[PDB]
């Protein structure tokens, strides 16, 4: 925003927003898998108790 005109900076800014945003989406998906695996372990632990 300090070097490029607003007519063209939209293209530059757009290709970077999606990339950062897409990286967050991957991280959330990984947590869901890990949470699912832990939930299975907890049920096994509860049965043991």
């Amino acid at each position: 925003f300090s070097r490029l005109d607003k007519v063209e900076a939209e293209v530059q800014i757009d290709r970077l927003i999606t990339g950062r945003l897409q990286s967050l989406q991957t991280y959330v998906t990984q947590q869901l898998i890990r949470a699912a695996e832990i939930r299975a372990s907890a049920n096994l632990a509860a049965t043991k108790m």
Binding site: S2, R3, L4, D5, E8
Partner: protein, 49 residues
């Protein structure tokens, strides 16, 4: 005098304040396009060489 194509002259600029408005004054500068920066934002940037 301007030198030939194969003998382009290289010039040094250092330690001075640059105003690009005086560049815009001359009429026949009908070919003025820049890649790395927007032409209208040259008045609030600093360079090293």
């Amino acid at each position: 005098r301007f030198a030939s194509v194969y003998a382009w002259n290289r010039k040094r600029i250092s330690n001075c304040v640059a105003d690009y408005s005086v560049l815009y004054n001359l009429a026949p500068f009908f070919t003025f396009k820049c890649y790395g920066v927007s032409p209208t934002k040259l008045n609030d940037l600093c360079f090293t060489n």
